Design a protein around this ligand. Structure first.
Ligand SMILES: CC(C)CCC[C@@H](C)[C@H]1CC[C@H]2[C@@H]3CC=C4C[C@@H](OC(=O)CCC(=O)O)CC[C@]4(C)[C@H]3CC[C@]12C
Ligand SMILES: CC(C)CCC[C@@H](C)[C@H]1CC[C@H]2[C@@H]3CC=C4C[C@@H](OC(=O)CCC(=O)O)CC[C@]4(C)[C@H]3CC[C@]12C
Ligand SMILES: CC(C)CCC[C@@H](C)[C@H]1CC[C@H]2[C@@H]3CC=C4C[C@@H](OC(=O)CCC(=O)O)CC[C@]4(C)[C@H]3CC[C@]12C
Ligand SMILES: CC(C)CCC[C@@H](C)[C@H]1CC[C@H]2[C@@H]3CC=C4C[C@@H](OC(=O)CCC(=O)O)CC[C@]4(C)[C@H]3CC[C@]12C
Ligand SMILES: CC(C)CCC[C@@H](C)[C@H]1CC[C@H]2[C@@H]3CC=C4C[C@@H](OC(=O)CCC(=O)O)CC[C@]4(C)[C@H]3CC[C@]12C
Ligand SMILES: CC(C)CCC[C@@H](C)[C@H]1CC[C@H]2[C@@H]3CC=C4C[C@@H](OC(=O)CCC(=O)O)CC[C@]4(C)[C@H]3CC[C@]12C
Lengths: 224, 165, 213, 165, 224, 213
């Protein structure tokens, strides 16, 4: 029943600032401390600070004391965090959390859904889709590997399906890689009976809603 | 000259008070202890200050003088304790009030009595607590440690003013 | 600030095994709290105050320890138990989280099926060459791919990515991509990736000749 | 005789130590303060100990001794200060460890810094708290007060052994 | 929803001992402190002590440290308090209460219904009911006062109604008084038109369930 | 241990206006908590941590104060507000409760209707004499009854009991009972109770002669 709600993502130009919100529901907002937590794939979980909306006392981790600023609307039941002077170091997931005194120690008993921040200067870019054509150079044991390469798009995500979703067995879609150009690239592959590559038609359906891209690519055994 | 017997007496009293404050300061108070205690400064300092009371032996000018000249070396070593002790105390008083320049692990039988405690940081993570009595205890203990260290500093300095020929 | 060290980094067990994982603090703490996270969600509270199960946690779990040394234990692992576990402390400022432990499922060794794709004509007409080396359905995760072009070792010009583990057969799939300029792609004849894995008695190379089709 | 100049020097050092420990003990630490502090003893004791250093005067035997006879009264009153000071400390050390024989309201500008604290009872009403750090903070403060008072006791006792001379 | 259930009352011989219980429901019993409180009309509210069922640590007020003993069943979710060497001083209401840490301080957020303890050597005694007959010596302004005296019963309570409950207007039943013989006495009165004391029938119906007494007394002006 | 004093002991107002009550500690406290109790129930929590209303408490109430001095205030009293209020503290060991404040409803002054009942014939056959003096529907509560027998003042031989205040007319009723042995009841002729009250310009005596019927 108790819940915390956050927006899903933010896009920010470098050096600008961003403000993101956590809204409470189902409990007496002014009676508990609200805490903020940062996660990254390189340094795990780090604690930013807290606010007591009952009176506006705050506390900060010194390492972030120059970045963050915590405030609360005592009437609207909304907490805000503001971050200033963003750099590539700040791309991370940020959570709000509620803490309660329970069983002789504090613990974080409820967590928000999390907000993702991307720091990037890059504009929206629609992808180019290139086939990984099946071939004798891709035939094995009565199976062939084939796929689609979704090259150079921004921002995430891309969705891939095959034959409008009629083909699903053996599909592996890999996590996107951020490239040195700042674009992303992704690939998806599937294995099919190599005996019928000459008779069966396979089309991947690529959608990139942020760019409204909707592209169908036929995949057929034209080697090279 | 005749001041010398008196000076020796003063030096001895000043040496005993270091043993007293050094013991009192070693009472369990967390995982971190002041540098001077981990250095054991108060015990050696006091011991050297007492031995340097040798001038209580007075001027035995019998034969070649029986304040044996090695005593001048004896006097000379004790001056080394006054400087270093003063510098140690003025370093510890900084570690309490801006940040850890150093941290030292205390001694194991001390930790057995205060394993969950520190005094070098003292502010709660939970802002609801900023008026809880639990916090007022920690500031009071910091104030006692600053007091003890400042008294040690001044009485140690009171050697260097006089422990020289 | 005190730091919590977790071991092992990757923990491996079959269903019905007993397993244990440990956290050691640099200093003694009042309690340890444990959290579970899976890809794509917020962490969940799991054990609070060293030994009390949170709401709905299955009875398979238990927690124990004191002072500087703590442990969490699972009596009979099950396929849903696969997650990352973080320990946490509140004894001092700031509160800190451990480096995490990742829990896998054991299975038998499976050698990868390897496939290689030359560039498409549409990519060459755009001015780009991408070479993809594919390793399919293998175990263990640990594998190595070296690119060789005309027997010359490539370096610093490739990226690879691996799927999450499949929930039904516990295998992995891996792709590596080599990217060159078109002008460099057509300077050579033989392009190769070399695959080494525990399931292979020797490296297997799949390669093709440019301009041979 | 020639011990007397030394004894005076010792008495002066012993007097300065009371000013030091008396000030340190008065650091804010709760609504109740030790009897000796509320009696204000540490100041008057030390002052009279230094005054009774009047035997610091040289024994000028100029027809009748320049240690004017009123100084003997001075010395005697300082002995009264020594006895009373010892008794007050051995009373306070009991009030910390069994129960309040007396309670004393401290001083208003002291209370301005520790209004919600008492060191004379120290056990939580909530048994979940018996391992909370706040309790270890309180017991550590009690141990510091027992220390300071015991050192005051022994150095005060060190007058009565000799101020009769 | 959280509830603490206690038994209603206890009768104890002097100098014996009594044990009373407080059963919890609706929450994790082992995770909160349980507190006991005493109420009397003389001293008001006094705090007896507490138990933490999570491990069995206890704390007592010194003034009661010789009387009480607190224990908990970690499995059955039941607390117990035992009292020993009872005297007339112990007749009071006893409450259990649940303490939580909330809004920056402790508070007692849930309370039990309370157990009443009576210390008395006396046996069960059925009352004698005497009429306070209406008369000219009880006539005023067109109204007459009449009543029933329920004298000397034990223990409490007595219930009084009039004409099987058909008369309720103007009835005042006074609180029972404990007498120096250790019995209780009570009286109930009602004012009716004085013009009709000779014509109307008024009967009080007295029930004392502990003694199973059920007595009807006609109240009429005809006695003095 | 620290003690909390409350004032006034009894407080009174007319519906619809402001009233205030104080609790003063002998030493400064971090917070005060307020409880409401009515006859025949457990206390209810009412205000926690000096100024936060508990669940369901009507917005008429507010709480304020700091240090040693605190107050609770009611903006517009209503007939349901009648109860006893205790302040409470957790600052030191043990926790303690105040002596309480009782809240009345004012009304106009009403003089008592007085009645007297001689002993019943049935009681005299049982060897007991009870004399009841009744004061009906009066306000304010303060009243005094003196028993006189043949103009001689009785003492130490009477008990009296009063209803609570009736919620529909706000008056009180009191009964006082004099009890004598039968042998002492028949030693005298004139038996009286004397009533004094603010609504009476002089005491009113109701009396009878024994054997007058
Ligand atoms: C000259 C200085 C540097 C060293 C002098 C050492 C001793 C005179 C004193 C100094 C501090 C004292 C310690 C201060 C506190 C304690 C805790 C004490 O334990 C308790 O007080 C609770 C258990 C108990 O003993 O009843 C055990 C002894 C000990 C280590 C004392 C043992 C004797 C010590 C080491
Ligand atoms: C600061 C304190 C705690 C440590 C240092 C004290 C020493 C520096 C003092 C203590 C005793 C002194 C010594 C006592 C005896 C001697 C022997 C003396 O030489 C002889 O007696 C010659 C005949 C012989 O060999 O016995 C020369 C001085 C010396 C070394 C003294 C040198 C200085 C000493 C070692
Ligand atoms: C021979 C006699 C004269 C020596 C007397 C020395 C001590 C008894 C006095 C001198 C200076 C005083 C200290 C001066 C400053 C402080 C800091 C003060 O701490 C704070 O103010 C913390 C909050 C803040 O930063 O303002 C507490 C008292 C204390 C330790 C005092 C304790 C008692 C001291 C050491
Ligand atoms: C012989 C004794 C009776 C007197 C010793 C000299 C006193 C005049 C000194 C000793 C300790 C000092 C007290 C120690 C601590 C404090 C707390 C202090 O407050 C703080 O330290 C924090 C706020 C601040 O002052 O910055 C206010 C002054 C006071 C009472 C000091 C005032 C001056 C005192 C009493
Ligand atoms: C800690 C405090 C209580 C010490 C108090 C010391 C006093 C009791 C001493 C200090 C100075 C002394 C005084 C110093 C000088 C004089 C003047 C002297 O006057 C004379 O006329 C002496 C020569 C003469 O008789 O002609 C009488 C003694 C008296 C009062 C002494 C009496 C005792 C005094 C007051
Ligand atoms: C001139 C030199 C020799 C004087 C040295 C005096 C202090 C340095 C020593 C002497 C006695 C020691 C004290 C003796 C007893 C205690 C009580 C002890 O506290 C407890 O044991 C609490 C638990 C319990 O009651 O068992 C902590 C150390 C302490 C303060 C010791 C602190 C250090 C003291 C004061």
């Amino acid at each position: 029943q108790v819940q915390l709600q956050q927006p899903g993502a933010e896009l920010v130009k470098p050096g600008a600032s961003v403000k993101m919100s956590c809204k409470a529901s189902g409990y007496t907002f002014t009676s508990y401390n609200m805490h903020w937590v940062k996660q990254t794939p390189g340094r795990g979980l780090e604690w930013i600070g807290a606010i007591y909306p009952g009176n506006g006392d705050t506390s900060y981790n010194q390492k972030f004391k120059g970045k963050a600023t915590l405030t609360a609307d005592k009437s609207s039941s909304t907490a805000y965090m503001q971050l200033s002077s963003l750099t590539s170091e700040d791309s991370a997931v940020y959570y709000c959390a509620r803490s309660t005194y329970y069983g002789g120690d504090w613990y974080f008993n409820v967590w928000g859904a999390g907000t993702t921040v991307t720091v990037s200067a890059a504009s929206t870019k629609g992808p180019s889709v290139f086939p990984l054509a099946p071939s004798s150079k891709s035939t094995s044991g009565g199976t062939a590997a084939l796929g689609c390469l979704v090259k150079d798009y921004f921002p995430e995500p891309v969705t891939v399906s095959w034959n409008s979703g009629a083909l699903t067995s053996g599909v592996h879609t890999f996590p996107a890689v951020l490239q040195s150009s700042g674009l992303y690239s992704l690939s998806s592959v599937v294995t099919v009976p190599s005996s019928s590559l000459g008779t069966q038609t396979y089309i991947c359906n690529v959608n990139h809603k942020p760019s409204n891209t909707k592209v169908d690519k036929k995949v057929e055994p034209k080697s090279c | 000259m005749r001041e010398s017997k008196t000076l020796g007496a003063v030096q001895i009293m000043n040496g005993l008070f270091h043993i007293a404050l050094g013991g009192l300061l070693m009472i369990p108070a967390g995982i971190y202890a002041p540098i001077c205690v981990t250095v054991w400064y108060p015990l050696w300092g006091g011991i050297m200050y007492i031995i340097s009371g040798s001038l209580l032996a007075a001027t035995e000018k019998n034969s070649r003088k029986c304040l044996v000249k090695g005593k001048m070396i004896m006097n000379s070593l004790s001056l080394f304790a006054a400087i270093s002790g003063m510098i140690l105390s003025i370093m510890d008083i900084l570690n309490i009030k801006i940040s850890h320049f150093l941290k030292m692990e205390s001694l194991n039988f001390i930790r057995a009595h205060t394993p969950y405690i520190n005094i070098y940081n003292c502010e709660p993570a939970n802002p609801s607590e900023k008026n809880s009595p639990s916090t007022q205890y920690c500031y009071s203990i910091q104030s006692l440690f600053l007091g003890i260290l400042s008294v040690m500093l001044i009485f140690a300095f009171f050697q260097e003013l006089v422990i020289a020929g | 600030q005190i730091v919590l060290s977790q071991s092992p980094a990757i923990l491996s067990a079959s269903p019905g095994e007993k397993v244990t994982m440990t956290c050691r603090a640099s200093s003694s703490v009042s309690y340890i709290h444990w959290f579970q996270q899976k890809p794509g969600s917020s962490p969940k509270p799991w054990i609070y105050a060293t030994s009390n199960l949170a709401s709905g946690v299955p009875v398979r779990f238990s927690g124990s320890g004191s002072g500087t040394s703590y442990s969490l234990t699972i009596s009979r692992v099950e396929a849903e138990d696969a997650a990352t576990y973080y320990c946490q402390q509140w004894t001092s400022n700031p509160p800190t989280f451990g480096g995490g432990t990742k829990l896998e499922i054991k299975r038998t060794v499976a050698a990868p099926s390897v496939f290689i794709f030359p560039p498409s004509d549409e990519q060459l007409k755009s001015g780009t060459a991408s070479v993809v080396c594919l390793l399919n359905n293998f175990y263990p995760r640990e594998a190595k791919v070296q690119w060789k072009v005309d027997n010359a070792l490539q370096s610093g010009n490739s990226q690879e990515s691996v799927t999450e583990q499949d929930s039904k057969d516990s295998t992995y799939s891996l792709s590596s991509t080599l990217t060159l300029s078109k002008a460099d792609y057509e300077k050579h004849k033989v392009y190769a990736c070399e695959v080494t894995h525990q399931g292979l008695s020797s490296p297997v190379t799949k390669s093709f000749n440019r301009g041979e089709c």
